[PDB]
Amino acid sequence: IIIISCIGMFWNVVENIKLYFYSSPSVKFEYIKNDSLYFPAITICPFLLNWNPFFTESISFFPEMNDIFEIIETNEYDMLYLWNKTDEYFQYDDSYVYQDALIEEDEFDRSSIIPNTEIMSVSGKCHMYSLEEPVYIGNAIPNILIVYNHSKIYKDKWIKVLIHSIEDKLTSHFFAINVGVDSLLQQMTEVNFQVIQKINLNLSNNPCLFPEEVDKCFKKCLDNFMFKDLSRIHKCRLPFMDYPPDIPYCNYTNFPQMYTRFNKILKGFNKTNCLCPRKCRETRYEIQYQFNIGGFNNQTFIKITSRNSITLETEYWSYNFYSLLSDIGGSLGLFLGASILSMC
Amino acid sequence: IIIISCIGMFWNVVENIKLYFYSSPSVKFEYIKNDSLYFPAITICPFLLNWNPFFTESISFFPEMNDIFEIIETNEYDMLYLWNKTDEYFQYDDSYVYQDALIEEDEFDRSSIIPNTEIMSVSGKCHMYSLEEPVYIGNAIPNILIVYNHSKIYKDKWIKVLIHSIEDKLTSHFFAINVGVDSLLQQMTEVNFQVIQKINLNLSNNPCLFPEEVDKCFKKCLDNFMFKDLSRIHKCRLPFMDYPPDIPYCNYTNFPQMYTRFNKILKGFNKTNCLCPRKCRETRYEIQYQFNIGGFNNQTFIKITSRNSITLETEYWSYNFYSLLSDIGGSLGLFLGASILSMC
Amino acid sequence: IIIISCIGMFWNVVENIKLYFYSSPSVKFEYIKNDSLYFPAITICPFLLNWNPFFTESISFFPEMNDIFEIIETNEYDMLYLWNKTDEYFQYDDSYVYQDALIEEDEFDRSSIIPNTEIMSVSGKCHMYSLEEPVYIGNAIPNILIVYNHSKIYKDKWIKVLIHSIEDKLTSHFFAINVGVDSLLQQMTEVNFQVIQKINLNLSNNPCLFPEEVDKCFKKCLDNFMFKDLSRIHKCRLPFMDYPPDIPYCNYTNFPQMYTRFNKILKGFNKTNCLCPRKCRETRYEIQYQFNIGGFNNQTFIKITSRNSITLETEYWSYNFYSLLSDIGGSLGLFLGASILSMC
């Protein structure tokens, strides 16, 4: 009985030390109403290069991608001139954060944003709008309004509004075509998003990093993963990649093949292969819903809002050291009635 | 060893008693499918007093707020007559709870609601629709349909549909302008909401109260906080405040200044300053999404629904007294092998 | 003191054994981003039999249900011919899973779905679209596009898009009228859904079963519950029930009464009465939101997507046996300083 109880004592002490150290961190889920919220960055990108009004409008038919490649081969474009000419069809006119009050704000309360306007992305030149300090959410979530002007009354012309975190401004626009929201030109749209905060625990085996460093790691991995295949193909870089700095930009002769490859490459690109550390404090913004207000307009109004609360996922340890010791003592006091003093 | 083990025993017993008493209550998160759900109250409010068709229609230009103030100064309106005249442009015709069945319900199954119609809010006179007993959600969530009639074929005229809890019917319409959903006149709209229940634990330091008392506390605090600034300005009360009962209603001369102040006052009003107790059983209704059905109509149809499940956040204590005693006993049996009997 | 401490020891040991065995399983809530997701089945069903263009179009007025019953009595329809003729007004033309890439997919990358097209449901003949293996969600959620062709330019004609799990393909279409989403004919629609996975624990008292068996149990219970009332009424089966296999299908004389009864029967049908076991691994798909793209079209495009992450609810036991033993030992070591050895 002393021998069986001692094999038991030792085993119940193993199980405890297991559940303390070798156990996954538990997760606390909350639906919080934060009085101040960090608004997302909004990247406005041009739609597929087969639909850019710089190509579509001139020619007669509705271009396809191969027709666009032939056009780029005929008129011999610098691929950087071609990237510059794409953004011309929204022509940002005004963007401001404003509140929905009982006396409509008029150019004095609304805070004016200045987009980046020089982002290079898979579809052309994109504009990023962002805020530097959080807005007050106590009464309601303020509205961002991006206004775009056009020259002609465009029909069936689209852009992409991608809502992301400013801490992911280096590797977010590339997926705007698939993760973005289609916005019709000359038509007011409302994109109500939802915020998902996740506080991860820094672990020795899996140490989380600041969002800046995780974004840099993802950007570097994306650049190497693009350049490997694009050097396999023709050994040049497209206008939307900055990594091989010496390696020259592609020309019109090589751009079609590279773009056709890169589309397929990006279709299956998976972030799991890019082994980068997690984020200790990560904020994501999902699209809660999209609404269309009114009919045709002479300006494209893009309204970004949230009608929802923040979803908080905090990682915490349910087992403390002071409970591990108590459980080991309980095992000792059940199986053998032992103690520190006793053993000693 | 006896002295170091005793300083240890005592410290492991402190940590335990800490984690039991001096610890935050843990939260259980569920996505429940309640067979019966309390439908929210729906407050239909007029849009900004610069857009009310009682002002906009008569004059030539599109009024601004200062033009409205000048008009209120010219035609000398009783501010209570002016609040009465605002609601005239939706003219409730019918509202009923109906189910989406395979044989459409026709005036015999649908339950008829009678709105309040006499709410006073920052924008004018508002109508509250509510249900007295829960509907059955077993098969699907029934639909509330509010029908509004108008005189002229109004163009670019809007109202505000605010979805709230009946237990918050005293301090909810005031924020309808910012927390509401814009509904276009003479156009069917669908406002699908989501329900967030949160069961808080009554704590000695932070004792929760019934939703009625929390709503009364918030109403009282809002009334005092409005009246302080509005007595600073001109020492009168607007048509949408009931608190200083003797204090006379404002007239046309003083209404412009008071309203202009009150807009700014409400822009930054924060409920944290209003220290009121939490709610033991609080139910919130967020807007899941908004859809537009059809084009122009001779009646404004507002459809309120839910296509989602309820989000339950229950506060509970993960540590019980019978586990505190066990952990203290384990600490005693590890560090010193002590016990009640022993010590005694 | 020995007697009071022993009544205490025994009681603290009861409380522990209670909280271990006789306690509800705890729930872990996560917002996961699964690299591969099982897309839902999409059931396209005709709208109410009073609005089917097979009836509405021929006659002059807008039929009501009683007018449809009179028509079914006049022209003497086989109720199976009548169920066949209803589906003719969407005429599936193409359905495929495609990704939103920077070079639009054209009939080579998109995977072609073949709907079931022979489902019998309360409203007529329905088409189920489904996928056999999960799609990759690493970069974005691919889009399902269902294309429908029509003969005439239909006005105010609707269908129902119900998003459900393939493991619930036997008892899901029946509620499509109430749980479905109204889609307007000849008009592109986007139905963005959200996924709710729930991993239940198999319990002796409440043993969960595979989704196939739970779906079969629900189908059987629905069939018996329909047939009981429908044999009370006229002792025949409607075209959308397969259970009493010998019992003949209803004819035009009896169909009106049976359908009128069955509508009311289905209005209050509750699954709680149908005592079937839970699902160990259940996946639900709720409608996140619905968007309308463009205006009139010659084809009905139904786009099914998700812009969101999966909501995971995993049931797990917070108390392990190796912690129960430790707590019992701690209770023994606190109240009496006992142990296995001691007692023995």
Author numbering:
A (entry chain B), B (entry chain C), C (entry chain A): 46 to 389
The paper states:
In this study, we identified a proton-dissociation-permeated sodium channel (PDPNaC1) in the antennal sensory neurons of the centipede Scolopendra subspinipes mutilans. PDPNaC1, which is permeable to monovalent cations, assembles as a homotrimer. Unlike most proton-gated channels, where proton binding induces currents, PDPNaC1’s transient ion-permeable state is triggered by proton dissociation. Thus, the identification of PDPNaC1 suggests the remarkable diversity of proton responses and molecular mechanisms in DEG/ENaC family.
At pH 8.0, approximately 121,831 selected particles yielded an EM reconstruction at an overall resolution of 3.03 Å. The architecture of PDPNaC1 is composed of three homologous subunits, each featuring two transmembrane (TM) helices. Notably, despite sharing these conserved structural features, PDPNaC1 lacks the extracellular knuckle domain, which mediates proton-induced activation and desensitization rearrangements in cASIC1a. To identify the potential proton-sensor, we calculated the protein charge distribution of PDPNaC1 (at pH 8.0) and identified a negatively charged cavity near the extracellular domain apex, formed by residues D227, D145, and Y143 in the β-ball and palm domains. The pore radius profile corresponds to the non-conductive state observed in PDPNaC1 at pH 8.0. Along the ion pathway, we observed two constriction sites corresponding to residues Asp372 and Gly375 with pore radii of 0.86 Å and 0.39 Å, respectively. These distances are insufficient to accommodate a sodium ion (radius 1.02 Å), thereby constituting two gates (upper and lower) within the central pathway, analogous to those observed at Asp433 and Gly436 in the cASIC1a channel. Above the Gly-Ala-Ser motif, we identified a narrow constriction site where Gly378 from each subunit converges to form a hydrophobic seal, with a pore radius of 1.28 Å. Notably, substitution at position 378 (mutants Gly378Ser and Gly378Gln) significantly altered ion selectivity, reducing the permeability ratios of monovalent cations to Na+, especially for Cs+, indicating that the mutants enhance selectivity for Na+. These results suggest that Gly378 contributes to maintaining a permissive pore constriction, thereby enabling broader ion permeability in the wild-type channel.
